[model samples]
Target: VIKNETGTISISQLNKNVWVHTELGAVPSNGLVLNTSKGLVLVDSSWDDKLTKELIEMVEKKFQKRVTDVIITHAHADRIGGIKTLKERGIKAHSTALTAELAKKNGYEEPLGDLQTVTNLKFGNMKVETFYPGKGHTEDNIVVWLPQYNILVGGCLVKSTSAKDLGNVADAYVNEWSTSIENVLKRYRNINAVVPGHGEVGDKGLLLHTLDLLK
Candidate 1:
């Protein structure tokens, strides 16, 4: 019964096939976990390695699967915060080439590169659509789309509906944010659930809401 909103970490099913994992702490955040034939694909990690370990344990124990591939949305600490631990665990990680480059420049952990250049990646039959709809949150920010389930992990590019404003603009592309979001919408028109970088999951309205913030 650890499915509620307020806790160190919370888990819920985004749909029958996908699970939404969230961490509630000083840096509250959300990510995606997809059960695939090859293994579990983790979209992002928590604030640090310790929390990442806990997230892995919960996922493996509850779903009886291990995290085989880690697709980091961006180089933001909250998203790729546990890449070091995941690497330590021998788990292969993936991220945009730009993300990898920038992360290294920033002295962060490195993952499998070329994420920004990859249009699609497959883990057995589980196909992920990785598109760089321009830049919003970060220059390397990309949205992960699971076409099979119509689930879009907007990550930090798409803001939560409740967000008063783009929470962190330190590295944000405010001028091009709306255009980038438009690119995301054009690519995935039939979305059922959208999991933002933070806040509760929502529908296409979240995309619209994020775009509205630019006005």
Candidate 2:
């Protein structure tokens, strides 16, 4: 039950299927979570190790799962904050090839520590893949897709509001944003819902609304 108009919020489903965490700040922020046959797969982590551990406990308490994987939605500190915790626990953290590499080449290499890329990962009965969505909000924005569920973890590819403009422009992808969204959309035509890095889980149609932000 923590919140900031621009901070993180955590909520678990009764069936323990999904979690939407919105972190507000400049250093990137936390993200959503999904339940798999293996355990809980955290889409992103917050900026503090303690908070990250707390989040881990919350998920365990609620979903009855340990974080088998913490997917970095992007390299921002808010998203990579818990890299250390994952490393120490040997929980395994992963991202797109580019984002995974960037996590080390960039600031994440020293601060939050090293990150392990998620390759050929499988959880329970669900199978999924992780990669960069394109270049909309950021060049390193990773997208997670569930072939079995037809759900895409679009992260910030979808707009949170209508009038929103540039955010953390240091890694902005003005030219690649729309095309990136299109690329991810093209990959999954049967998507029924979207789990963004922040905010609530919405319909796949939200991608179109985000496209308007570019228009």
Strongest candidate by lDDT: 1
Which ranges of candidate 2 are over 4 A from the true structure?
1-8, 14-16, 23-30, 110-120
By summed lDDT, the worst window of 10 consecutive residues in model 1 runs over 1-10
The per-model lDDT (C-alpha) reads 0.84, 0.66
Inter-residue clash pairs, candidate 1: 96-116
lDDT of 2 by residue, 145-202 (tens): 7666666777766655432654556777777788888887777778867775555567
Q: Which clashing pairs does model 2 show?
A: 6-24, 7-24, 27-78, 37-124, 38-124, 135-176, 135-177, 136-177, 155-197
RMSD of each: 1.9, 4.0
Q: What stretches of model 1 exceed 4 Å from their correct place?
A: 1-7
Write candidate 1's Cα lDDT for 115-209 as tens digits. Answer: 75447889887898888888898888988999888889999888787798888789988889899999888878899889999998898999999
How many clashes (backbone atoms < 3 Å, residues ≥3 apart in a chain or on different chains) does model 2 have?
9
